Paper text:
Nsp9 is a conserved accessory component of the coronaviral replication and transcription complex. It is the predominant substrate of nsp12’s nucleotidylation activity while also serving to recruit proteins required for viral 5’-capping. Nsp9 has a unique viral fold and was originally proposed to be an RNA-binding protein, more recent work suggests it is a central element to viral mRNA cap-formation, making it a potentially viable therapeutic target.
The final model has two copies of nsp9COV19:VHH2NSP23 complex present within the asymmetric unit. The binding site of VHH2nsp23 upon nsp9COV19 is extensive resulting in a buried surface area of 1380Å2. Residues within both the VHHCDR2 and VHHCDR3 loops make up the majority of the binding interface (27% and 66% respectively). VHH2nsp23binding was seen to occur via an extended antiparallel β-sheet interaction that aligns the VHHCDR3 loop with the s4 and s5 nsp9 strands. The native unliganded form of nsp9COV19 consists of a mini β-barrel in which the s1 and s6 strands wrap around the sole C-terminal α-helix. This form undergoes structural rearrangement in the VHH2nsp23-bound state, with antibody binding inducing repositioning of the α-helix from outside the barrel to in-between the s2-s3 and s4-s5 loops. In the apo state the tips of the s2-s3 and s4-s5 loops are in direct contact while in the VHH2nsp23-bound state they are 30Å apart.
Residue numbers in the entry:
A (entry chain C): 24 to 75, 86 to 111
B (entry chain A), F (entry chain A): 0 to 126
C (entry chain B), E (entry chain B): 1 to 126
D (entry chain F): 26 to 75, 86 to 109
The structure:
């Protein structure tokens, strides 16, 4: 199946960036996102995984929390 | 339509005892929400206690309650529950059931919620 | 332990419409036949409409047949009452009613104990 | 590599980023820098059919923050 | 340890063409997106063109679209810039740019540290 | 386009030690050439040291270095290497990477080459 968009890509037709999680275990249910301001963490439920090697799509992404999960990942790489 | 949360089950109990909180959620597509509980002890900030996924078959707990509390839900009645065993005095707080703004998501930050019930008091004491 | 919050009422002009809502809290909603009652001033509560648990069959008082439409959302545990072609006679307090057992309903106001607070519906010139 | 950020839980977990469109001829994706200091290009991978989904290559310690900051502006 | 030798520049007349070359030494060339930058007198280096590792997709600044053509030879580890319909505005030093990691490019001159010596391109009446 | 060869890796080392020469070749369809190394000790003529086939999986060495030197190449980076172990003083020379004029061919005669780099010095001494 398909999930929702992290951000929209203004270049292609009906183009969206999707965010997925890769892990070695196939039982995962939620993903964790420490917030950038350290006030807590954001949990997003995942889809049923795929095997390629286990890949989970995110279902909790909204037009709005998108910024908080984007902001979280940015703090993680730094 | 507005989301309403009716919490109950608190009371006065002695250390080592148990209690069982209940929350009836009105006005939301309940089975698509991750639900959870927070608590606010006197003079302390409101903290995350536990959470349960929309489907009911996976959970998460604050470290301070792991092994003693059990969160569960009933998707037909739109109710969430918190089974609290082996109660300690530091478990004294007002307990709040929490419904997030969006579906399939939860935050441990009480600032990210705006549908708060009135809460239900839990007192763990000698009396 | 079973709570009913009703909303959607107001003051409208004859011929207008309204949509009442009732969110039910604390019951295995999808196994109950749900329905609505109304109570004009002084007169006793009367049956309006009923809808079976699954949501796909209904029954109406004859005074509202063809004008009202009851529906339900087993997801949100809510039942609705769409009111069209309103008449002054329709003025009354509207109540959402949940019976004491599953898969059954009664048009007797006396057979109920789960009553909401109601929502006022006033159909008049103002 | 395809890692947008690293998951610190177990089994070496990473968040991957994919771009989806109606097309299958795509080869790269653009990410304008939020400062306006230019754009970052990263090559895509052979798409998968289920629309068309293309994973992203070219993610490194030098551009992860800029691509994140690019999608944050979006 | 990564060296870039550029060539092909010169002085031509508006409307003429030129073909720049850059042979790259010391990197797994076929895994890099390569591209070209240019720097007029005084002004800061600007992006010209880029071409992905495999050689079959490209992108150009808008001022050179339709006139320039970038290509590559993964055999000789060389990238090329065919310049047609030259304008005086095109005068500048041209630089071949190799990024610090594979499969990615940036149009920001600041994100690069592998810079050739350049090749002068002068488009004028003489 | 002209072929350019950038040699490196030489230095001063003591007998029995090792070194590793590198040569980055610019401007030629590298994977179709047999590449090799020569060396020119002070006052002696330039001599063949080793060679490697285009594909990288067969080699040849002068007798004086057999068993001690290893030539290898990387067709992606267009680089040739010379691993020199068990160095002796007679190994002192300027080392030159060599690219022949045509593809799939090599000569042990330094007169048959015209693309010579600057070389890199190897000194095998007590200091």
């Amino acid at each position: 199946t398909d999930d929702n968009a992290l951000a929209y890509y203004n270049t292609t037709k009906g183009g969206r960036f999707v965010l997925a999680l890769l892990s070695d275990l196939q039982d995962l249910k939620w993903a964790r996102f420490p917030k950038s301001d350290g006030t807590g963490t954001i949990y997003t439920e995942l889809e049923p995984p795929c095997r390629f090697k286990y890949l989970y799509f995110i279902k909790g992404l909204n037009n709005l929390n998108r910024g908080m999960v984007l902001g979280s990942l940015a703090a993680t790489v730094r | 339509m507005q989301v309403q949360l009716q919490e109950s089950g608190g009371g006065l109990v002695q250390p080592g005892g148990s209690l069982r909180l209940s929350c009836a959620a009105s006005g939301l597509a309940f089975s698509m929400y991750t639900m959870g509980w927070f608590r606010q002890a006197p003079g302390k900030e409101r903290e995350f206690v536990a959470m349960i996924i929309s489907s009911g078959d996976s959970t998460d707990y604050a470290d301070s309650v792991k092994g003693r509390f059990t969160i569960s839900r009933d998707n037909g009645k739109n109710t969430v529950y918190l089974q609290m065993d082996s109660l300690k005095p530091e478990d004294t707080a007002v307990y709040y059931c929490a419904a997030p703004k969006f579906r399939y998501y939860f935050s441990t930050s009480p600032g990210d919620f705006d549908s708060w019930g009135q809460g239900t008091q839990v007192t763990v004491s000698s009396a």
